[PDB]
Amino acid sequence: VHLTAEEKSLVSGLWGKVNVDEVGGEALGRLLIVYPWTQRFFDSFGDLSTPDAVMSNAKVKAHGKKVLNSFSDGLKNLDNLKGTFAKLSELHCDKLHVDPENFKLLGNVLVCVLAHHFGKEFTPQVQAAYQKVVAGVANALAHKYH
Amino acid sequence: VHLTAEEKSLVSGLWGKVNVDEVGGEALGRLLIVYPWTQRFFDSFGDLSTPDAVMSNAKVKAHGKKVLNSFSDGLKNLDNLKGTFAKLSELHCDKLHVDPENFKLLGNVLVCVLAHHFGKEFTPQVQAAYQKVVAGVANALAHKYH
Amino acid sequence: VLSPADKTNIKSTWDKIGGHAGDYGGEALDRTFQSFPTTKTYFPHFDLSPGSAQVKAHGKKVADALTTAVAHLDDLPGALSALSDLHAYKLRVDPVNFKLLSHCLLVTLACHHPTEFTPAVHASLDKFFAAVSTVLTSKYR
Amino acid sequence: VLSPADKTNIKSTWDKIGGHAGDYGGEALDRTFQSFPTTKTYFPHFDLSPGSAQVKAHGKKVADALTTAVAHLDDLPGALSALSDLHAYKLRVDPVNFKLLSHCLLVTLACHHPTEFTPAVHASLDKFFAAVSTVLTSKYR
Ligand code: HEM
Ligand code: HEM
Ligand code: HEM
Ligand code: HEM
């Protein structure tokens, strides 16, 4: 999980002006829409039956913000992704039984949303660093299967 | 990994009767036949154009044996898979750039060859143990990609 | 897509398994559940113990689905559209799990019919299960 | 799949893309190279530098292919036959890199078209890129 001293700054540069309130629920909302089998885990979240329904569902947003925080916690501690997501790996792997394929997927729709949010400021330089972060998070969250 | 006392004894049980000179080559050869796109990496192996041709390829055969031994080496080191397969990570990841997904593929078609040779006594129980062993060898190999 | 030969291979090996087929459903489910424990989650309602009569039955329902497939290779989507709607809309399986069971479908084959499980056949059966997996995940696309 | 809903979204979107299509192919390729260094390996013969004209020029040809695809959505297979052969028989591109370039093609469009890139359109485009890719790999099967 390397991320050059430039890339690390290329990442908080960007994450400084992320909209904690709207980004997280947005990526989680599109995930459910683009990979519909992922609503299996959200039986308690109310109505998800049409793209508009998902986008405005208030739990997707709320839960979405909490999930953002994990990534925030991951950006602050990049040399110890395991420890930071240790217990969070247990929840998904040992209790929710989410396939870690889907951790890759959420990360990628998160990159998309950031592209969508920052537009041209999300340079190929920047994207490639964020791919590194999302892989390590997606992967450190998948340790309880290793 | 995981690998309970029971499992470990079963996994050692089988290896002792695997054919060292033949199983490895049979597994690379089927991975070659079955996922033709893996052939990209064997441009010094001579003719691969037919299954019956791939399965007589002396080099495919002799290189399969090499792959077993690093498994034998992994099987004696379930505790330090990350270390045992450390340097082969570099080769596959820094030098060849084999996508890591094909580690998981080769492992799996090994499980098919174990299965093909053993029949009855390759119990689902045994197979589970060996997926655990395959899966860890794949992460060991994909580590520099981590 | 399945070359004519792919279908020749699929049709023969399925002939040779014959009355055995239903029972291989149960074994291949078994191996999936033991090898990848993440999968059992889809069957809370199932007794999952060793000799489970319940899995037994279901595995048979599964092989049955596959015996139908082998009789309709030129049109799977049509022949297997009920199980799509069920698996995509209602079960919301994860496409990864078809990748997994299909491996365990091969592994069972090799365990029982080593004479017919030649690499060319291994390749055509892998192609066959993947085609069945694509139809049943089709509603996601 | 490729339900008239998605076809409408792809078509509609490719339209506001306009002349910027070829330009994107280049940026998309650029993006795949930086994010997934494993991939640059198909282009040992390219300068993969910052301004590369080869990279610029290749992207036009990729962007042209996708427009042919948009123009023939009920038959991608026949439309893309020459590329199926090329990417399977000659280049032996890994099925896993269509997923990788497809993601980067999706990022490209987000970056440039913030309005059009709604969730529903984002899923439709994903279908379309997976479809194109399904067909390019179609010769390992
Ligand atoms: C890879 C990045 C991911 C991160 C950072 C993440 C983060 C989190 C966090 C922090 C929680 C706990 C919130 C709380 O309980 O207070 C949570 C819960 C949960 N996550 Fe994840 N997750 C990720 C991926 C996924 C994926 C891919 C899925 C399934 C498709 C998933 C499904 C769930 C479910 C079902 C819960 C239970 C929360 C509830 O029911 O209220 N997560 N996730
Ligand atoms: C089960 C995972 C794998 C293991 C344990 C493994 C092991 C090895 C070992 C031990 C060697 C070098 C042995 C020697 O000559 O001293 C090797 C070389 C090589 N492997 Fe792997 N490998 C794995 C997966 C793969 C895969 C999936 C591919 C391609 C798709 C691959 C392609 C190669 C190539 C091209 C070489 C160099 C062969 C040469 O000398 O030309 N390996 N691998
Ligand atoms: C080629 C692969 C598959 C085939 C041919 C297949 C076929 C079937 C059939 C025939 C049924 C029952 C039909 C009925 O009772 O009306 C069924 C149900 C079911 N399938 Fe699958 N299936 C496949 C893959 C999977 C996978 C990968 C999973 C997830 C691990 C899965 C999970 C389920 C579940 C939970 C049921 C309901 C069982 C019940 O209530 O009796 N299936 N499938
Ligand atoms: C949407 C996905 C893709 C499309 C539409 C596409 C299309 C094309 C086209 C139109 C060409 C040029 C053929 C010609 O010059 O007549 C080409 C060549 C090529 N493709 Fe792709 N391709 C795709 C994905 C990929 C992927 C994923 C890879 C591997 C990472 C790849 C590797 C190559 C290479 C190495 C060439 C030859 C470059 C040259 O020397 O001209 N392509 N592809």
Give the whole-angstrom CA distance, residue D28 versus residue A29: 24
How many residues would you count in chain B?
Answer: 146
Q: Following CA atoms C59, C63, C66, C70 in sequence, which dihedral angle do they give, to the nearest 10 degrees? A: 170
Closest residue in chain A to residue C89, using alpha carbons only: A37
CATH number at residue B75: 1.10.490.10
What does the block give as tokens for A134?
């999302």
How would you classify residue C38: left for phi > 0, otherwise alpha for psi between -120 and 50, otherwise beta?
A: alpha
D111 has a chain A CB within 8 A of its CB: yes
How many residues would you count in chain D?
Answer: 141
What does the block give as tokens for C46?
């199932």
Give the whole-angstrom CA distance, residue C8 versus residue B136: 37
Chain D contacts of A111, Cβ < 8 Å? 103, 107
Chain B contacts of D95, Cβ < 8 Å? 37
Give the whole-angstrom CA distance, residue C77 versus residue C70: 13
Residue whose C-alpha is closest to residue C111's, from B111, B119, B27: B119
- Please tell me the distance in Å from B29's CA to the nearest CA on chain C: 8
Give the whole-angstrom CA distance, residue B56 versus residue B54: 6
CB C138 to CB D1 under 8 A?
A: yes
Q: Residues with beta carbon inside 6 Å of ligand 4? A: D 39, 42-43, 58, 61-62, 65-66, 83, 86-87, 91, 93, 97-98, 101, 132-133, 136
Give the whole-angstrom CA distance, residue B102 versus residue B104: 5
CB B101 to CB D88 under 8 A?
A: no
Residue whose C-alpha is closest to residue C98's, from C139, C132, C141: C132
What does the block give as tokens for A143?
């340790």
- Please tell me the distance in Å from B56's CA to the nearest CA on chain A: 36
Closest residue in chain D to residue C130, using alpha carbons only: D141
Q: Decide: A66 in ligand 1 pocket, CB within 6 A.
A: yes
Please say whether the beta carbons of B132 and B1 come within 8 A: yes
Please say whether the beta carbons of A39 and A63 come within 8 A: no
Please say whether the beta carbons of C132 and C66 come within 8 A: yes
Give the whole-angstrom CA distance, residue A83 versus residue A74: 10
Residue whose C-alpha is closest to residue B37's, from D137, D45, D77: D137
Please give the residue range of the domain that contains residue C71.
1-141
Contacts of B16 (CB under 8 A, 6+ apart): none
**In chain D, what is the straight-line distance between the N-terminal and C-terminal CA atoms, in Å?**
20
Contacts of A129 (CB under 8 A, 6+ apart): A3, A4, A7, A8, A10, A11
Chain C contacts of B125, Cβ < 8 Å? 34
What does the block give as tokens for B137?
């060898």
State the resolution, in angstroms.
Answer: 3.0
What does the block give as tokens for A131?
């791919």
Binding residues of B for heme b: 63, 92
Please give the residue range of the domain that contains residue A51.
1-146
Question: How far is CA B103 from each of CA A111, B137, D127, rounded to the nearest angstrom?
Answer: 26, 8, 27
What does the block give as tokens for A44?
């308690």
CATH number at residue C129: 1.10.490.10
Cα-based angle A17, A66, A20 (whole degrees, multiple of 5): 15
Burial (CB count within 10 angstroms: exposed 0-12, middle 13-18, buried 19+), residue A42 = middle
Q: Residue A19: helix, strand or coil by DSSP?
A: coil
Question: How far is CA C19 from each of CA A3, C23, C60, rounded to the nearest angstrom?
Answer: 57, 8, 11
Question: How far is CA C119 from each of CA A37, B51, B140, C123, C125, rounded to the nearest angstrom?
Answer: 34, 7, 28, 6, 10
DSSP H or E stretch at residue D136 = helix D119-136
Please say whether the beta carbons of A75 and A15 come within 8 A: yes
Give the whole-angstrom CA distance, residue C51 versus residue C59: 12
Contacts 24+ apart (CB under 8 A), A83-89: A84/A140, A85/A137, A85/A140, A85/A141, A85/A143, A86/A143, A88/A141, A89/A140, A89/A141, A89/A142, A89/A143, A89/A144
Please say whether the beta carbons of D117 and A116 come within 8 A: yes
Q: Decide: C132 in ligand 3 pocket, CB within 6 A.
A: yes
B111 has a chain C CB within 8 A of its CB: yes
Closest-CA residue, ligand 2 atom 9, reads B67
The rounded Cα D78 to chain-centroid distance in angstroms is: 17
Chain A contacts of B146, Cβ < 8 Å? 1, 136, 139
Contacts of B54 (CB under 8 A, 6+ apart): B29, B32, B33, B48, B60, C119
Quote the number of domains for chain C.
Answer: 1
Give the whole-angstrom CA distance, residue A125 versus residue A131: 10
Technique behind the model: X-ray
Quote the number of domains for chain A.
Answer: 1
Structure letter (DSSP) for residue D73:
T
The rounded Cα C80 to chain-centroid distance in angstroms is: 12
